Design an enzyme around this catalytic site. Structure first.
Site, short mmCIF file in Angstrom:
data_model
loop_
_atom_site.label_atom_id
_atom_site.label_comp_id
_atom_site.label_asym_id
_atom_site.label_seq_id
_atom_site.Cartn_x
_atom_site.Cartn_y
_atom_site.Cartn_z
N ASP B 80 -73.11 29.59 -73.14
CA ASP B 80 -73.37 28.15 -72.88
C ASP B 80 -71.97 27.41 -72.61
OD1 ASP B 80 -74.10 25.47 -74.49
OD2 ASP B 80 -74.40 25.83 -72.68
N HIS B 178 -73.87 13.29 -69.60
CA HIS B 178 -73.37 14.51 -69.45
C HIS B 178 -72.37 14.74 -68.27
CE1 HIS B 178 -72.78 19.13 -70.54
NE2 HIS B 178 -72.99 19.14 -69.10
N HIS B 208 -78.72 19.68 -68.63
CA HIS B 208 -77.79 19.68 -69.79
C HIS B 208 -77.95 18.23 -70.27
CE1 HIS B 208 -75.12 23.04 -67.89
NE2 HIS B 208 -76.21 23.35 -68.17
N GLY B 209 -77.56 18.05 -71.60
CA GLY B 209 -77.05 16.70 -72.25
C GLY B 209 -78.38 15.97 -72.40
N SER B 211 -81.55 15.21 -74.78
CA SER B 211 -82.07 15.67 -76.19
C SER B 211 -82.90 14.57 -76.41
CB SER B 211 -80.96 15.94 -77.28
OG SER B 211 -81.29 16.80 -78.40
N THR B 252 -80.73 22.53 -75.59
CA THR B 252 -81.15 21.92 -76.87
C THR B 252 -80.12 22.38 -78.18
OG1 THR B 252 -83.21 22.08 -76.42
CG2 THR B 252 -82.92 21.34 -78.50
#
Ligand SMILES: [Co+2]
Ligand SMILES: [Co+2]
Ligand SMILES: [Co+2]
Ligand code: NA
Ligand code: NA
Lengths: 297, 305
Positions: B80, B178, B208-209, B211, B252
């Site tokens: 990652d 992000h 990404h980013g 959540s 996540t």
């Protein structure tokens, strides 16, 4: 390198030093123990109880065994306190190189028969075994290990190293004040039992650690462990394997507590687990210094 | 069993579901994620950041790769946000089956050069790669018709990027806090943009980013004595639609750390006499597992194994 428990313990007793058997339940305890061993260039024993077996499962055993093979010091993976024949089979199955079958709470013949059965299975796959004679209790007499019976027990079972009851016990509350260790009995046993000897419940539980624990919010009674001098002399008399668990747990929990008390906003587990892991490592290193295994690799 | 990231992400996008890329740093987190995957009969991606590689070291990578081979569901081990070529080398060395190099903070030409170099190394060893493009480069010469349109990813640029680097899947900037768009506005998902990107890029897309950061979780965290700012995560529906539009991999991590941390606090606050690690790490591990299982549920990967 991954070797049997006896290869390490036999060398230890012959050379007058002790090797630590440190209980581990996850990745960071295992990392702390092994790095400590590498930094001290000292042999070590990774101890996994049946509890660690259930908690860590395949992941833990995978780590213990494979990482042991890559260690630049001798390492043995030990089943601590196997309660049955089947528990032992699963340790053999998981690649352990040392296993203990604890039936000291059983009568002599039963203890002999159960231990002998384990010895045969283990020896058939090149694993060495630890057995225990006597009940680890506070303070011949009582149910402390009998010298002549120890000889008999070892000859009949074929066990490789013996756990002896000479005053120690498990937990943080060994005794009120300095617990008494029957060093006279230890010597008698050693005189008749040439196999390396084992000391269970040997954590130091130093007062400052109990103090550091309480300060972080921990609550514990008038804990107390085996005195460093008792351990040093026990080793000189034949003790080659010293078990340590409680000490590691206290140090770990303490550091985690301080980290969370001081930083509300911290939720990155590495930030509080990391320093706790480091502390465990420092304790392991001290213990090795005490046991006299530094530079022994 | 252990497979490449592309095998998993390709199947996911073609079938319309997302696969969670759950960051792990130790044994408990890894066990939580794999058990979640097994109980949900769902493929899963174990992600390890460089912080994880450092902290977990050989122990973590040993567990990630080996336990992945034994899983009954397909599993990929992924680096990652790598920050260097050697970082990618160490991951290839450790048996990873998916690597990601992040040079989106670099100019289009360097990003291409850097990424292409990782792709060549990875493909030489049978490993697939994720690349990331954020800001609008200006390659074919495009003018931001909006303050966001300048930070987020331009479809056309995305096509060319993938065409030149030869990457296997792509992470794109579409509104999550992000990268360039971080702290530059309210988190959201520019679905229209995502759709345009997906039209020109058939490769699985990465998010990404993003959540969930549900209020119940933060509540429990704050109740345990933790302090956190007004967390702002993407809405479930958005994630479900982004996936419908092409998102196949959803990073996540934050949600796991929160649950894990909260439970350790509850156990230590309530049981000050406790110093057996298993007593507070175990329930924490379970909480993580539950979060993972819900995400798989939300992502639509249940029974896709
Ligand atoms: Co013991
Ligand atoms: Co014992
Ligand atoms: Co990114
Ligand atoms: Na033992
Ligand atoms: Na990634």
């Amino acid at each position: 390198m991954l070797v049997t428990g006896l290869e390490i313990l036999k060398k230890a007793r012959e050379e007058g030093y002790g090797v630590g058997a440190f209980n581990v339940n996850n990745m960071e305890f295992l990392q702390a123990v092994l790095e400590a061993a590498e930094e001290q260039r000292s042999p070590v024993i990774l101890a996994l109880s049946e509890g660690a077996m259930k908690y860590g499962g395949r992941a833990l055993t995978l780590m213990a065994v494979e990482l042991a093979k890559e260690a630049r010091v001798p390492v043995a993976v030990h089943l601590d306190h196997g309660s049955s024949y089947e528990s032992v089979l699963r340790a053999l199955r998981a690649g352990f190189t040392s296993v203990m079958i604890d039936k000291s709470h059983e009568d002599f013949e039963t203890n002999v028969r159960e231990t002998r059965r384990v010895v045969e299975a283990a020896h058939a796959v090149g694993v060495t075994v630890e057995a225990e004679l006597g009940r680890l209790a506070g303070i011949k007499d009582a149910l402390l290990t009998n010298p002549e019976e120890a000889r008999i027990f070892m000859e009949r079972t074929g066990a490789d190293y013996l756990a002896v009851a000479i005053g120690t016990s498990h937990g943080a509350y060994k005794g009120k004040g300095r617990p008494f260790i029957d060093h006279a009995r230890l010597e008698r046993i050693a005189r008749l039992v040439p196999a390396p000897l084992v000391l269970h419940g040997a954590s130091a539980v130093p007062p400052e650690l109990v103090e550091r624990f309480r300060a972080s919010g921990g609550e514990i009674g008038e804990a107390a462990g085996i005195h460093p001098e008792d351990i040093k002399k026990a080793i000189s008399l034949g003790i080659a394997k010293i078990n340590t668990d409680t000490d590691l747990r206290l140090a770990f929990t303490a550091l985690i507590r301080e980290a969370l008390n001081k930083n509300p906003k911290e939720f990155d587990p590495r930030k509080y687990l990391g320093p706790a892991r480091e502390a465990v490592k420092e304790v392991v290193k001290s213990r090795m210094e005490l046991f006299g295994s530094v530079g022994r690799a």
